[PDB]
Write a protein that binds this DNA or RNA. Structure first.
Ligand SMILES: [Mg+2]
Ligand SMILES: [Mg+2]
Ligand SMILES: [Mg+2]
Ligand SMILES: [Mg+2]
Ligand SMILES: [Mg+2]
Ligand SMILES: [Mg+2]
Ligand SMILES: [Mg+2]
Ligand SMILES: [Mg+2]
Ligand SMILES: [Mg+2]
Ligand SMILES: [Mg+2]
Lengths: 150, 83, 207, 84, 190, 129
RNA sequence: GCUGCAGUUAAAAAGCUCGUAGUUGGAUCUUGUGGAGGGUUCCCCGCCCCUUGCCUCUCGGCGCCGGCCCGAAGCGUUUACUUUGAAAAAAU
């Protein structure tokens, strides 16, 4: 099931077995490169690029018209942010919860949920570190953690 | 069931369910021995020969002797597909 | 049966449509699901009649394979069946049981009604549960007229039909008595039988 | 269930009632379609479960809407399934 | 050319040179010059099939093959009118690096990209045979003696563009690898 | 969370033979399972079987006859040394006239009556009888 | 009780969740014939790209009529596993 909830649902997605390019699609393996670059200059994370390209244009799977997954693209042009987006998205949640905690110190359910968020953060760091992705001296400390989000 | 001479050494040889292939021990008073007539295919009349079927007890008491006999009949000239 | 001389003729189709045997109930089983064609737009199922015919000729072939005709015991407890089974005992030499069944008729060597058949035709497997669960003690095959909602347990050749109490019960028994006599060779095929189905229908309040 | 169902050749109409993960090969329930608004005339192609407010590259203020499932169109004309 | 157009292949080759001169002389006259671009091939091979016939095979160099596919149905129709009775299939000449753990010397040389394995090539070559159509599923029957048939499903559109070519495909593939394939068509696409 | 894939495959085949089915679907699958089912088929305990591609781990459909009685896995793949093989086929097997121990050796996945023939031991996978 | 026990009611599952050591971890990266021992394919040699994987030598023996051919030296990325050898006092 989940890792911190009890529920256990299957709501994933399911790719087509036919990996071929969609026969009718106009866009070609170089135009999407520039579309991705332009979309990234506005400041969109990889997932947001993916959903924009999936709705507004016909490219269902960036990885199939191109050869690469859309993060190695932002990497091989010096555009990926310094730290991955999941860790940023979790640290942003933790700093959101800590403010509410200090404003009303009786929200014990917020205390429990904050404990859970910080543990997920540690579990994700510990893995990014042994992948040569973060400085092995990396750390998550509240007051440092706020400035981290920028 | 033979030995180093060949001659069989066995009280008897039980018969197996035709739908489950599990031998039918001699205290199973639910196994049945259905016996279905042939016809002569030109006049539509019974003529000597017939085809025999064995059905175990357990598959009979789980409600599956029906479809079993049906498939065993379709497997021969008794229904010839197109059901 | 696969050939032509055994295929359903268009007058039997009209008897079936007149008695309403194709009309089923509102419920279903997971075992009678291959006999249904579809479900009507008000909540009732429809019985495929070619499957009815194939199962009918299979039961006919099961009765014809019994040498002495007198051990093909024919049971029916509900009213709508009684008159039918009595005519069946007249048509072919079988042995009727119409009324209450008196448990232990097959498995008691002391009772005065102890009879040891070799086959068992029975209407309505749900209202005759007792003869079925007693056939489960003496290696006794079974034949039965089920419905859209009839539990299949200890039955072997299920002839789907209305049998909810109708002209359909009588029609089914009459047609089964025709086909046993035909393929045993006691009456000739495609000369219509002198008997009339209404000899097998029930007494609704008379006059 | 008859105790003898054959699984290598399922029903072409039952194979489409089971969840997308639970059928012999996985297959999405989504599709792509060519919407065509009245007025300004361009053939912009949209995902079904769009979850973005798309626009016509011209004279429209909106072209479809996000919902819990499939996007609902305003007045889009053709929206043919693109079938590749 | 017709002799220098089979590099790394022991250039003097009779039938490959003949087919080379034929195909590049169709590249010579400007009738079909805007979609053929004087591009090289690398080998060719004609062999029997199981229906008392014969068919020919063209080995393309790999990075060209996406451009050959852009024209392949018109170009093969042109070659078959020029080669009545025979069939032309385009496959790239893929390299296979033996399994380093212990099949050749391991020397910390390089990683053996997973694209250069055995099975990656053995399934890409299978998709090159069927080109006008598309693979839509696979299956394998393990027969009662350990033997294997590969069941391949091909797309339902493009039928008459491959329908008569199913039985040459089995021969050429049994030739290239050794596996006994059979091709069918799916009743419904869901 | 699915640590042992052979354990599921053999338990899945086994929970269905007792019920009386005629075909079973196994998911995921592997080279190991496919090799094991081949050993179970060369001897006649199951019928032929068909593997489904789906661009992930695949699925297998197996045709069962009634001849099978049990199959199972020994969960830690212990080592066996051809002098401790008898102490295994005397604890796991029902009689010295039928049944097979299946083990993986440097010469492939085989059954003990062949490991004795080629003079090698290895790691125990399971048994079927 | 490792083979091999038990934990609803007989003796017994921490009130509840998080968490480092410990224990456990999904799928995936090479196959057919000509001879040999054993049959009617399949299981010491080399062949579809590979087959002890190569190299390049040098000093010393094995060949032919100097010139050319093949055994040795490097080891193949490392382990666990399995099999064989060596080496292990007598008495019991
Ligand atoms: Mg789950
Ligand atoms: Mg969530
Ligand atoms: Mg946990
Ligand atoms: Mg979700
Ligand atoms: Mg997910
Ligand atoms: Mg005790
Ligand atoms: Mg008490
Ligand atoms: Mg207690
Ligand atoms: Mg508790
Ligand atoms: Mg693993």
């Amino acid at each position: 099931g989940r890792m911190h909830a009890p529920g256990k649902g299957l709501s994933q997605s399911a790719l087509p077995y036919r990996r071929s390019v969609p026969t009718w699609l106009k866009l070609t393996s170089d135009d999407v490169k520039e579309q991705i670059y332009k979309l990234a200059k506005k400041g969109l994370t990889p997932s947001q690029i993916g959903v924009i390209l999936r709705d507004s244009h016909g490219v269902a799977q960036v990885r199939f018209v191109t050869g690469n997954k859309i993060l190695r693209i932002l990497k091989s042009k010096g555009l990926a942010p310094d730290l991955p987006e999941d860790l940023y998205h979790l640290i942003k949640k933790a700093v959101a919860v800590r403010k509410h905690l200090e404003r009303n110190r009786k929200d014990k359910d917020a205390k429990f949920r904050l404990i859970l968020i910080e543990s997920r953060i540690h579990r994700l760091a510990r893995y990014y570190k042994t992948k040569r992705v973060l400085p092995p001296n990396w750390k998550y400390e509240s007051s440092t953690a706020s400035a981290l989000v920028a | 069931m033979q030995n180093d001479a060949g001659e069989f050494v066995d009280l008897y040889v039980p018969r197996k369910c035709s739908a489950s292939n599990r031998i039918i021990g001699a205290k199973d008073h639910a196994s049945i021995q259905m016996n279905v007539a042939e016809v002569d295919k030109v006049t539509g009349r019974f003529n000597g020969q017939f085809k025999t079927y064995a059905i175990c007890g357990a598959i009979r008491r789980m409600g599956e002797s029906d479809d079993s006999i049906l498939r065993l009949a379709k497997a021969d000239g008794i229904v010839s597909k197109n059901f | 049966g696969a050939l032509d001389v055994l295929q359903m003729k268009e007058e039997d189709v009209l008897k079936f449509l007149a008695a309403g045997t194709h009309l089923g109930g509102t419920n279903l089983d997971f075992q009678m699901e291959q006999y249904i064609y579809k479900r009507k737009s008000d909540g009732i199922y429809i019985i495929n009649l070619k499957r009815t015919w194939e199962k009918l000729l299979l039961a006919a072939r099961a009765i014809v394979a019994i040498e002495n005709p007198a051990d093909v015991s024919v049971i029916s407890s509900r009213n709508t069946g009684q008159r039918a089974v009595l005519k069946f005992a007249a048509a072919t030499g079988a042995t009727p049981i119409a009324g209450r069944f008196t448990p232990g008729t097959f498995t008691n060597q002391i009772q005065a009604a102890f009879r040891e058949p070799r086959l068992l035709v029975v209407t309505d497997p749900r209202a005759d549960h007792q003869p079925l669960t007693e056939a489960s003690y003496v290696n006794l095959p079974t034949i039965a007229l089920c419905n859209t909602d009839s539990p299949l347990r200890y039955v072997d050749i299920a002839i789907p039909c209305n049998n909810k109490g109708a002209h359909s019960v009588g029609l089914m028994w009459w047609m089964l008595a025709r086909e046993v006599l035909r393929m045993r060779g006691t009456i000739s095929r495609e000369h219509p039988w002198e008997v009339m189905p209404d000899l097998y229908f029930y007494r609704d309040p008379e006059e | 269930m008859p105790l003898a169902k054959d699984l290598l050749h399922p029903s072409p109409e039952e194979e489409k009632r089971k969840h997308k993960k639970k059928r012999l090969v996985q297959s999405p329930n989504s599709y792509f379609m060519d919407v065509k608004c009245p007025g300004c005339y361009k053939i912009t192609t949209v995902f079904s479960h769009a979850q973005t407010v798309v626009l016509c590259v011209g004279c429209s203020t909106v072209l479809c809407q996000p919902t819990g499932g499939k996007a609902r169109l305003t007045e889009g004309c053709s929206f043919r399934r693109k079938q590749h | 050319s017709a002799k220098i157009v089979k590099p790394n292949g022991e250039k003097p080759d009779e039938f490959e040179s003949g087919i080379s001169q034929a195909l590049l002389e169709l590249e010579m006259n400007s009738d079909l010059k805007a979609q053929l671009r004087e591009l090289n091939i690398t080998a060719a091979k004609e062999i029997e099939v199981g229906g008392g016939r014969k068919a020919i095979i063209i080995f393309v160099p790999v990075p060209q093959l996406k451009s050959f596919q852009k024209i392949q149905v018109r170009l093969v129709r042109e070659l078959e009118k020029k080669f009545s009775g025979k069939h032309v299939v385009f496959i790239a000449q893929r390299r296979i690096l033996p399994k380093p753990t212990r099949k050749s010397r391991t020397k910390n040389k390089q990683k053996r990209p997973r694209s250069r394995t055995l099975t990656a090539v053995h399934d890409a070559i299978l998709e090159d045979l069927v080109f006008p159509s598309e693979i839509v599923g696979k299956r394998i029957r393990v027969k009662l003696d350990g033997s294997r048939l590969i069941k391949v499903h091909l797309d339902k559109a493009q039928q008459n563009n491959v329908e008569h070519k199913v039985e040459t495909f089995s021969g050429v593939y049994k030739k290239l690898t050794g596996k006994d394939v059979n091709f069918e068509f799916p009743e419904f696409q869901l | 969370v699915r640590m042992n894939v052979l354990a599921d495959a053999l338990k899945s085949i086994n929970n269905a033979e007792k019920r009386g089915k005629r075909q079973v679907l196994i998911r995921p699958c592997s080279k190991v399972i496919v090799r094991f089912l081949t050993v179970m088929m060369k001897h006649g305990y199951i019928g032929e079987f068909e593997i489904i591609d789906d661009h992930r781990a695949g699925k297998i459909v197996v045709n069962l006859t009634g001849r099978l009685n049990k199959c199972g896995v020994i969960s830690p793949r212990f080592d066996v040394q051809l002098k401790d093989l008898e102490k295994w086929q005397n604890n796991l097997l029902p009689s010295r006239q039928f049944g097979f121990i299946v083990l993986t050796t440097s010469a492939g996945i085989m059954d003990h009556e062949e490991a004795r023939r080629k003079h090698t031991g290895g790691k125990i996978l399971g048994f079927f009888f």
